[PDB]
Amino acid sequence: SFTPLVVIELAQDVKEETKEWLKNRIIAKKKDGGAQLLFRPLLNKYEQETLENQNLYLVGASKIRMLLGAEAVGLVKECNDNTMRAFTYRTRQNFKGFDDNNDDFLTMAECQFIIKHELENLRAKKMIPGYPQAKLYPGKSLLRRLLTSGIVIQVFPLHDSEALKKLEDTWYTRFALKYQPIDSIRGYFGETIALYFGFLEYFTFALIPMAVIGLPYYLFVWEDYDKYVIFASFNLIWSTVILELWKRGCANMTYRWGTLLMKRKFEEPRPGFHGVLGINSITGKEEPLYPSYKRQLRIYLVSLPFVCLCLYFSLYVMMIYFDMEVWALGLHENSGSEWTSVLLYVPSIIYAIVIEIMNRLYRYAAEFLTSWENHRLESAYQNHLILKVLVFNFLNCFASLFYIAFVLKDMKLLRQSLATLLITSQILNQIMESFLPYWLQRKHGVRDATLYEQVILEKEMGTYLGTFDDYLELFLQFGYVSLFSCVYPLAAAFAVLNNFTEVNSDALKMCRVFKRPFSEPSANIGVWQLAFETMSVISVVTNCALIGMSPQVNAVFPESKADLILIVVAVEHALLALKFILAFAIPDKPRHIQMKLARLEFESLEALKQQQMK
Amino acid sequence: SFTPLVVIELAQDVKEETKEWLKNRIIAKKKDGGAQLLFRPLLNKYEQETLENQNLYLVGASKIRMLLGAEAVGLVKECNDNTMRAFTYRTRQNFKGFDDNNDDFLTMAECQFIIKHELENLRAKKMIPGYPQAKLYPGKSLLRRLLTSGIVIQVFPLHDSEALKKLEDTWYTRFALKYQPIDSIRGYFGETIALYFGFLEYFTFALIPMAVIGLPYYLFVWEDYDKYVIFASFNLIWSTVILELWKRGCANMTYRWGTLLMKRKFEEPRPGFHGVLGINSITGKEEPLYPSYKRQLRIYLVSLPFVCLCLYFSLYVMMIYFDMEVWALGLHENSGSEWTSVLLYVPSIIYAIVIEIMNRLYRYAAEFLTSWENHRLESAYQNHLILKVLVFNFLNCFASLFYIAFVLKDMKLLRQSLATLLITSQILNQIMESFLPYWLQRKHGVRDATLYEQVILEKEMGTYLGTFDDYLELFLQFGYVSLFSCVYPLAAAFAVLNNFTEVNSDALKMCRVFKRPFSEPSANIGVWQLAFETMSVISVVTNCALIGMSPQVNAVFPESKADLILIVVAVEHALLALKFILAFAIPDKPRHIQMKLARLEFESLEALKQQQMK
C-alpha cells in the first residue's frame, strides 16, 4: 500500500525462476544482500485484458529506509545554521526544514535517485538463474546484466501529474516575461536538467545586451559610426564575464542546492565496455579488462582517419556549395534583379539543410565509432563523443564564415550570407528539434486507473537523451553570435527570440512529451565550460580578425599593411593575455561561498583534531 | 639525559617569572595544556665563564612521545605493502622499516619538525607574565609572542656533526661526475631543501643536451647551417618536457618520501599581520583583524606605483646604458681596433653590476613594501613578494636583449652583448653569492664541549633565508638560456659549468656556512612551477620572434614581409596552442602513482562504507 516512485518493466520471455530470484533479491533486507525495498506487482489481481502488463513492478520504501538511503547516497542538505552538510541519521535533527511529521523533506527525485542508486549498487556475489547466456560473476551489478541481456525491458520513474501541473502553471510563460523557476525545476527534475535550464536562462539573459544594442543598430543604419567594434569587444568580454558568471551562478545554485559540496563518486565501467574477465588493478575487484593500447590503436588509427574523412567530405561539400554559389551569382548576373535576389538565399538554405543532415549523419557515425572503441567510464566516452561532435559542428558551421571573411573578403556578401545562414539554421533547428515533433506528439497524443493509464502512457513516452543536443544548439547559438557579431548583430535577437520559444518549447518537451528522467547530480556543466571558454577564446581571434579587416582601420594605415598586421597580432596576443589574465585573477567561487567552504573544511580539521585527541 | 635536538636561546633581560612560567608551560603534559617535552638548561651547573650562555635550553622527548608527535603532525610513511599512509600509533606495526628497537625510524629532522610543530601549536588561553607590553589573548601562539617581543632570542635545531660529515663525504663531488644524494639530503635537511637541490639536479641534467649540442656549434662555426632554429625549438619543447618531468620527478620523489600525500595544513597568520583584535569570520576564533580594502588600497595605490617608479628608473638606467654604449661605440670608432674591442665589454659589465646592485636594492624595497601591506598568510605574502621580484628581475635582465632584438635588430652586436651579459652576470652571481662570502666565512672561521662549542658556533652561524634567491638565480639562468638561445647557445654550458660549481658551493654553504634549517614540508616548487611555465611560454614567443627575424627565413619571402608576419603569427599561435595542448594532454602524475593514489582513495571509500555500515 506504499507510494510507487519507479516502475520496472521486465521483458516478456522471462522465466519464473529468474522472476522469483529477482523478487527475492529485491525484497530481502540490506544485511542479507538484498535491498529492503517495498515491492509490488502492477495489479494484485489479473484479468485477460492486463496480461500483457504483467511485468510492470512498483518499487518504494519506508521513510527511515529512504532517510538511510539518503545517508547511503550522500545527499547534502542544509543544516539549521544555514550550512550545507551531508545527511546522516544520527545527526538528523540538525538539518533545516526537518520534522518528524514532514513527508515533503526528501523530494521524489532524491528518493528515485536513491532507489536508482540502490538498484545500481546491488551486485551479485556465475550466471543469472534461468538464463544461460547471461554471463555473471561475483562483483557484477544485477541491473546492468538485466538491462543488457534483455530481461528488464525498462526502468522508469513516475511523473507526478499534480506537481508537474503546478510546475507547468509556472513554466509556460505565455503571458509575458517571467523568471523561470529553476529551483522548482530542480526539485522536480534533479539538478542536471535544472543546470541545462539554468545555463539557458543565463545565456538568454546574456544575449539581451547584445540584442538591445543591436536592435537600433539594425533598423537605423548605425553600422557606419562604430562599425561593430565596441559591441563585439563588449560581447567577448561579456562572454568571459558570463563564463565566470555562469560559474558564479552555478556556484550560487549548487551551494543553494548542495551539489557544490557533493564528493566525486567513483565511476563504474560504462554499459558496453567488454573485455576479458580479470583482476582490476585499481580497485582489486574482478572486472572485464581490455588493453589500453588496442583501444588507443582503435582510436588513433581508425577513429581519427574516419573523423578526417568526414571533415574532408564536409570541406568538399563546402567547396561544392561555393561553386554552386558562384554559379548562382552568375545566374543572378544573367537573368535579372527582382527575382534573382531571393534565389541567392536558396543555396545557403540548402547547405544549411545539408549541414543539419550531415550533423545527424555524423552523430550516428560518431556514436557507433565511440561505442566501438570500448571506453571504460561514461565520462571519458562522453568527452570523446563531445570532442568529435564539437569538432564536426564547429567545422560545419563556421567554414563558410571563415571562407567568406579570410578568402573572399567581401563584407556585403558576408552580411547577406551570415544573416541567411543564421536565420535558416535557427529556423531549421526550431523545426527539426521541437516543432515538427510537437505536432507528431500532438498527433500521437490524439491517437487503479491513475497509475495504469500513466504507466501505459509512460511505456510509450520518449526518453531524455541527456543535455547534449541542447548544449550543442547553445554552442551553435554562441557560434552564430560571437563568430559573426561584426556583419550582423541583429541575429543575436533572432537567437534570443528563438530561445524565448525554446524555454517554452523544452518546458513543453518536459511536460507533455517525455518520460520522467532519472535524477542525475551535476556540479557544473563539465567540459562544456571549457568548450564555451574555448569558443570565447576562439572568438577573441575572430573578433580581432574582423577588427583587422575593415576599410575603416585600414584607412589609418593605407600604405603600410606590415605594421597593421604587427599591431593586430600584438593586440590579438594582448587580448589572449588579458583573457588569460582575467581567467587567472577572478576566483571561481565568491568570497562568502569560499568562506563557507573554508568553514566546512575547518570544521573537518577540528573534527580530525578531536578524533586525534581521543 | 636525553638527546638534544633543538636549542632555544632566550634573551638577556628576561625576568625569572616569565622563565619559570615558560618552563612550566614547557614541562607540563599535553593534557594539562603543556607540551610534555624533556627540558634542560645548557649546563646543570654554572661558573663565571658561561654566565652569558644561561638562556640556551635543550628540548627533546621520548620515543612514544615522538611517535605520538608524528601522529599529531601527520607524517606519511611507507607501509609494509609498499604504500604511503599517515602514521598512527594504533596501526604502527603496519609500517615499513619499523621495529620496537629502531631509533633510526623517525629522523632527527622529522623529530625537530614535530618539536617545531609542537612549539608552534602551543597557544595560551591576557599578557605574558612579567612583561607588560607583551599583548596576549586566549588563542594566541606563545612562540610568536616570544619571538616578536624579544624574549626568545633564537630557536635553532642542532647540526649532527657525524651525519653531516657522512653527507659531506658524498656531497662534495670533487673527483668527477656523481649523482647527488637527494634522498640523504632529504633525510638530513627536510624536503624543501631537497626540492631545491632536486630542481637544481633536474635543471643541471636538462641543460646538458643544450650544452652538448652547443659545444661543437660554438668552436666549429656551425651557426651557419641550422642557424639556431632546431636547438631552440628543441630547448623550448624540452623546457615544457622538463617542466613536466620536474613535476614527474617531484611526484616520484614526493611519493618516495610521502609529501605527495600530505594534506594541506591550515595556515596561521604570518608573523607580522597586525590589526585590531576581533572575531575571525572563517575560524570563529579571536584574531587581529585588518580590513581588506585598506590592504588593497595600500597595494593597488602605493605598491604598484612604487613598482612602476622602480621599473621606470630601471628603463631609464637601461636607456642611459645605451647612450653610454653608443658613445663607447663612437669611442671605439674614434681611437682604434686593438684596445677598443675590450672596452666595449666594460659598460655591459658595469650595467650588470648596476643590475646586481639594483636587484638587491629592489629586494630591500620590496621586502619593506610587502611587509607593510599586512598580508595575512605567509604564502600570499611570499607570492606577492615573488611577483614583485620576478617582474623586476625579468625586466632588469631581458630589457637589453629585447631592445637589441626588436629595436636595433643587429645580431652581431646581439651575439656580443648576450655573451658578455650572460658570462658577467654568471661570474658576478658566483662572486657575490658564495665565493666572496666563502672567503669571509673562511676568515670568520679562522678567527660537554661537543654541544657548547657547537651552540656557540651555531649562535653565530647564518640562517637560511629560504630557496628564493637560489630559484631566482635558476630563473635568471633559465632566462639567459631560453631568451637568447639563438645568438649564443654556448652560454648554456657556461651556466652548467656554473651550476656544477653551485651544486658544490651550496653544499658547502649547507655544510660549513649556515645553521641547521628547520625542516619544512613541500609537495612542489609552488608558484615557481607556474613561473617556469610562464618563462617557457614567454620563451615560445621569443624563440619565434628570433626565428622571424633572421635573414635566412627572410630570404624565403624577400618582397612580401606581410605574409611572413602572418605566417609567423600563425606559427606563434600554433606554438602557443601546442604548448597548451601538451600541457592539457600530459597528466601530471604517472599512471601507477595515480593508481596508488586511487587505491589510497578507494581504501578510504571502503573505510567510509564500513563506517557507514556499522
Swiss-Prot record, chains A, B:
Pfam families the UniProt entry points to: Anoctamin
Any one GO CC term of the record: cilium
Organism of derivation: Homo sapiens
Keyword entries, A-Z: Cell membrane, Disease variant, Membrane, Neurodegeneration, Transmembrane, Transmembrane helix
Entry similarity comment: Belongs to the anoctamin family.
Intracellular or extracellular location(s): Cell membrane
Extracellular face residues: 214-225, 323-337, 407-473, 548-563
Tree of life domain: Eukaryota
Transmembrane spans: 193-213, 226-246, 302-322, 338-358, 386-406, 474-494, 527-547, 564-584
Miscellaneous field: The term 'anoctamin' was coined because these channels are anion selective and have eight (OCT) transmembrane segments. There is some dissatisfaction in the field with the Ano nomenclature because it is not certain that all the members of this family are anion channels or have the 8-transmembrane topology.
Gene name in the database record: ANO10
Disease with which this protein is associated in UniProt: Spinocerebellar ataxia, autosomal recessive, 10: A form of spinocerebellar ataxia, a clinically and genetically heterogeneous group of cerebellar disorders. Patients show progressive incoordination of gait and often poor coordination of hands, speech and eye movements, due to degeneration of the cerebellum with variable involvement of the brainstem and spinal cord. SCAR10 is characterized by onset in the teenage or young adult years of gait and limb ataxia, dysarthria, and nystagmus associated with marked cerebellar atrophy on brain imaging.
Transmembrane helix is among the record's keywords: yes
Protein name per its UniProtKB record: Anoctamin-10
Annotated GO biological process: chloride transmembrane transport; monoatomic ion transmembrane transport
Function: Does not exhibit calcium-activated chloride channel (CaCC) activity. Can inhibit the activity of ANO1.
